[PDB]
Amino acid sequence: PAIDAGYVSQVIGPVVDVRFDGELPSILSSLEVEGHSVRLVLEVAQHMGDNTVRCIAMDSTDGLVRGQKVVDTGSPIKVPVGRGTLGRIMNVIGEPVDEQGPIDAADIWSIHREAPEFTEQSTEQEILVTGIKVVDLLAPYQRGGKIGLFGGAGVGKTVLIMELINNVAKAHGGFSVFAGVGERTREGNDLYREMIESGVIKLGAERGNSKCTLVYGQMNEPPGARARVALTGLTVAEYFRDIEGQDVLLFVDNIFRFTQANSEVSALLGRIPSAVGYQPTLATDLGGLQERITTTTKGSITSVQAVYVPADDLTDPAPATTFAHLDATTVLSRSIAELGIYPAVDPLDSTSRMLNPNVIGAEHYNVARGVQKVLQDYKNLQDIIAILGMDELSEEDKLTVARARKIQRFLSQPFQVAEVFTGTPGKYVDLADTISGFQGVLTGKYDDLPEMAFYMVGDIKEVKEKADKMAKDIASRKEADNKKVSEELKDIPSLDKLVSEIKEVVIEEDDGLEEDFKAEALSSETVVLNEEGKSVPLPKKN
Amino acid sequence: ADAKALDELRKPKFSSKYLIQHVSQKLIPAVKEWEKSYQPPVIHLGRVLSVGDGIARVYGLKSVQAGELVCFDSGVKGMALNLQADHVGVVVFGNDSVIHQGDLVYRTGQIVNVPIGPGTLGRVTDGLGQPIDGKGPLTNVRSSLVEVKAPGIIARQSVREPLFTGVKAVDALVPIGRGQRELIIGDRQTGKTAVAIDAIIHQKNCNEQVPKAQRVYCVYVAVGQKRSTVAQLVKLFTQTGAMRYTIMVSATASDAAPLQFLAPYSGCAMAEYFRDTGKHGLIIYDDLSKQSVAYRQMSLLLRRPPGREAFPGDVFYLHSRLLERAAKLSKELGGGSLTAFPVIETQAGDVSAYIATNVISITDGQIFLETELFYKGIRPALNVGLSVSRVGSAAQFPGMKQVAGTLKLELAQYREVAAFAQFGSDLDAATQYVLERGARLTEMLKQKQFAPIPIERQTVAVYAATKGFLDKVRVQDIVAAEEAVISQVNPAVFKILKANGKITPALDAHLKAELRKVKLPGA
Ligand SMILES: Nc1ncnc2c1ncn2[C@@H]1O[C@H](COP(=O)(O)OP(=O)(O)OP(=O)(O)O)[C@@H](O)[C@H]1O
Ligand SMILES: Nc1ncnc2c1ncn2[C@@H]1O[C@H](COP(=O)(O)OP(=O)(O)O)[C@@H](O)[C@H]1O
Ligand SMILES: [Mg+2]
Ligand SMILES: [Mg+2]
């Protein structure tokens, strides 16, 4: 009980130093702190050198005293994995935070492991149809690949990642894991409640028929919990890939917050900071996590990760390092969103490795490369169109600006998760309707239609449905004077009879503020503790 | 020099005691002649080793909790940030010029507290809960921690109820739900406070008309402001009667940077009294961009490595752990709520700055206040194309939701048509309907300060504008046509629209009838 039970030696925010009198814990070991108000586990990060470990708190450290007993659990953070974890919400240390009882577990896996080996990789590319036009055309997603959605605070990468949950994750037929890393807790409640009414999560005795397990380390957590909750989301996804042997969908909302939480911690671990202010170990910290999120020869993980870009800077080293770890990068722009185009996907900055004529076919590939060619040549014109206007263009170039304004609107589409605030019902567009529709605008079959008919429509059947409506409206606009339902006697009572049908409510006048409240009698003096711990008034000197 | 060689020096290895026995009889006489030169030793108390930059290094304090109130013998509070092996670094809640090296540091035994309760309502307190309005101590109150963790996923529910701002552009286009945090972001001098003050005045008008459980108790946190601005604001709340429901937490520009850093957590803890007891709070953090500058000062004076714009790495966690406490609680937790309005000042309209984009990633919507619309007299200068409220939409007034769908759309066309041709190339008759209706609705939405409008007078005024009833007036007397509308219609039509919530078809053509017998000033 004396050795292998260390004591808290110093506390600097999220970073605790524990001194062990003998047998130091290994690096990445979990350490419980005895006598804290909540369960405080500490993950050993460094051996400092004088029988001291430096460790990271997975909860708050306000309350730690410099003698507090710390027991070593002899192993890393081990979280419940299995089919019993489906339909549950876990935090970083595997505790259920959904009040549904304890998580019955097939196994309790540590959240730290190595990547699958090079002999364990699987090199197969089949497409993942998402129903999104700009995605399925220009940067198509791979069915076992890594997908990154790059965004700059309000450009739409949570709406896009909830749309992929809506489109892909129901027709997938496998298990999903949603690791929420450092995002809003309101959004964790929204997804959890909307999965219960979708039947993706089933509560009670039918819990085993759930298809999704949630791991949440949201933005109220201390930076140790947000730095490790991506790792316990993968461990749940890796059990379904390795042991259960099946196809998983991992959705990681803001994998940037993993990098940012290690950057809050790294200042206090005594490290010289790297470029912009990040950890010196940014690429290997992120690399060690991302290399675990792969498709192996035993199972598949289709990983969609939102990547926040800070201050809209794509050269920031946390977005810039992530780009190499992904098979498909969907870059969402702020200027595209200010033109009202949603999803705000930059068509000339989003990239897939599936855009290859031997993978998606030459008809799909030539449309995507032709769409990108007129959008690029239009971008080359925008300096002149701003200054000189379109009147100074060649009419060869005016056909570019006319077509590229049309496909820019046609890349946008309504979402079935955005209908609750936009009003417009959402359109799943099939891949064959995407390819044929943009091929028509490139050849010139739809230069008749105005450029606003292409805006927020499903496929090329519906731009003709919307252009007909636009033409029809410009003719019929008014002549609704009377002989409608607004007659002052048919459907309508007296106005003063409606006053009396109001149920008048009673108003209580007293504000209800002192019904249960108990007031601490605060003293007229600052109450302090003397050398013997006694509650004493503040003595009188300086 | 390893510890294997140093822990051999535990066991005695001298075998010759001719100097141990000698000085053991002369040491206590030696110390006794130097006792007026010894400060008394310190183990559970503290003694200040170094003070400067607003950080004290305190020897001793063997059993301080991390992050608890310590009290200097000068009477100043501190907070034990880092407990080190040899000292404790405390951050001084006040002026560090009154702390000396050698001063006693006393332990209060509690993590940092503010008085919360019903008796903090009405008062002007500082960043630590000590009242500065001069009218006594806080009574009918109890202490609560300022660093509570936000409620989790299962302790929350969806945002259902509307928080009426009384601002016409806000409650129509960017409507605020009742557990929702909403950023007010704009340049200097753009009406950012005026939107937050009109919300606080408006809740006073509604608390005498709701049955005690739907009462909003506002809290205004002023970080980094001038003390004359705060005193002019307390006078405005006192003369409108809004201080009966308002707490005013003030850490001004002359206060210490740890007081300005702590003041939004102090005020959030006072507003979390109403969230936790089933009531409803409204917290305003005026210049949360000034609270990050105060925290950047403390982090650089603690010699922590700066990142982008020299802000620390955890300046996101500074604001995210704060604004996450603005929640709508579930019904087993009382159903209470707290809605936040952070204010971020922007430099030259640059929304892609560091602290601005941090709070956009935290909050649920924005109210962008454009400098260019504010110079044209369109006040509140609400950038309609950029201001969002997605949590508060489908939680708004059902009558306003009927008429503002056309209002947002006719403004959506108005921005799109004005994007094409503002200078007179050629004017269509269809697009000059849009510029005639768009300038109608823009003059409709601009309202003047410190007079928030009820939501039933606000639905009717937009009903009179998205429909006909105002196309006669050009653009100029539309402000005078609104009180021509809202005073000349029968005041019973505001009572049925309030009590039903929406425009029934019985009230629909009644209100068409009252809007045809109002006399419009443009004739
Ligand atoms: N709706 C309005 N109608 C008319 N005048 C207004 C309105 N709102 C604000 N003003 C005036 O414009 C100025 C803006 O003041 P306010 O304090 O609201 O802006 P602010 O953005 O908080 O400025 P600061 O950043 O300096 O605090 C004030 O002088 C105010 O009197
Ligand atoms: N596909 C979309 N359709 C309509 N509006 C959208 C779409 N994507 C984003 N938005 C708007 O932009 C805001 C961005 O929100 P969110 O997607 O949560 O941003 P973030 O990328 O910061 O997570 C949304 O609240 C919504 O108003
Ligand atoms: Mg998001
Ligand atoms: Mg102001």
UniProtKB/TrEMBL annotation, chain A:
Pfam families: ATP-synt_ab (PF00006), ATP-synt_ab_N (PF02874), ATP-synt_VA_C (PF22919). GO terms for cellular component: mitochondrial inner membrane; proton-transporting ATP synthase complex. One of its GO terms (biological process) is proton motive force-driven mitochondrial ATP synthesis. It is an enzyme of class 7 (translocase). One of its GO terms (molecular function) is proton-transporting ATP synthase activity, rotational mechanism. ATP 1 binds at S352, R353, N356. Residues 143-337 form the AAA+ ATPase domain. It is found in: Mitochondrion inner membrane. ATP 2 binds at R353. ATP 3 binds at R353, N356. It comes from the Eukaryota. Mg(2+) 2 binds at T158, E187. Mg(2+) 1 binds at T158, E183, R184, E187, D253. Keywords: ATP synthesis, ATP-binding, CF(1), Hydrogen ion transport, Hydrolase, Ion transport, Membrane, Metal-binding, Nucleotide-binding, Translocase, Transport. ADP binds at G154, V155, G156, K157, T158, V159, R184, Y342, F421. Gene3D superfamilies: 2.40.10.170, Bovine Mitochondrial F1-atpase, Atp Synthase Beta Chain, Chain D, domain 3 (1.10.1140.10), P-loop containing nucleotide triphosphate hydrolases (3.40.50.300). It catalyses: ATP + H2O + 4 H(+)(in) = ADP + phosphate + 5 H(+)(out). Its EC number is 7.1.2.2. HAMAP family: ATP_synth_beta_bact. Belongs to the ATPase alpha/beta chains family. F-type ATPases have 2 components, CF(1) - the catalytic core - and CF(0) - the membrane proton channel. CF(1) and CF(0) have multiple subunits. F-type ATPases have 2 components, CF(1) - the catalytic core - and CF(0) - the membrane proton channel. CF(1) has five subunits: alpha(3), beta(3), gamma(1), delta(1), epsilon(1). CF(0) has three main subunits: a, b and c. Produces ATP from ADP in the presence of a proton gradient across the membrane. This is ATP synthase subunit beta. The lineage of its organism: Eukaryota, Viridiplantae, Chlorophyta, core chlorophytes, Chlorophyceae.
TrEMBL record, chain B:
The keyword Nucleotide-binding applies. Residues 396-517 form the ATP synthase alpha subunit C-terminal domain. It comes from the Eukaryota. Mg(2+) 3 binds at T193, D286, D287. Transmembrane segments: none annotated. Residues 166-389 form the ATPase F1/V1/A1 complex alpha/beta subunit nucleotide-binding domain. CDD domains: ATP-synt_F1_alpha_C, ATP-synt_F1_alpha_N, F1-ATPase_alpha_CD. Keywords: ATP synthesis, ATP-binding, CF(1), Hydrogen ion transport, Hydrolase, Ion transport, Membrane, Metal-binding, Mitochondrion, Mitochondrion inner membrane, Nucleotide-binding, Transport. ADP 1 binds at S389, R390. ATP binds at Q189, T190, G191, K192, T193, A194, R379, Q447, K448, Q449. GO terms for cellular component: mitochondrial inner membrane; proton-transporting ATP synthase complex. GO terms for molecular function: ADP binding; ATP binding; hydrolase activity; proton-transporting ATP synthase activity, rotational mechanism. Its main location: mitochondrion. Residues 45-109 form the ATPase F1/V1/A1 complex alpha/beta subunit N-terminal domain. Mg(2+) 2 binds at T193, D286. It is found in: Mitochondrion inner membrane. ADP 2 binds at R390. The keyword Membrane applies. Mg(2+) 1 binds at T193. It holds the Pfam family ATP-synt_ab_C. Mitochondrial membrane ATP synthase (F(1)F(0) ATP synthase or Complex V) produces ATP from ADP in the presence of a proton gradient across the membrane which is generated by electron transport complexes of the respiratory chain. F-type ATPases consist of two structural domains, F(1) - containing the extramembraneous catalytic core, and F(0) - containing the membrane proton channel, linked together by a central stalk and a peripheral stalk. During catalysis, ATP synthesis in the catalytic domain of F(1) is coupled via a rotary mechanism of the central stalk subunits to proton translocation. Produces ATP from ADP in the presence of a proton gradient across the membrane. Belongs to the ATPase alpha/beta chains family. This is ATP synthase subunit alpha. The gene is atp1.
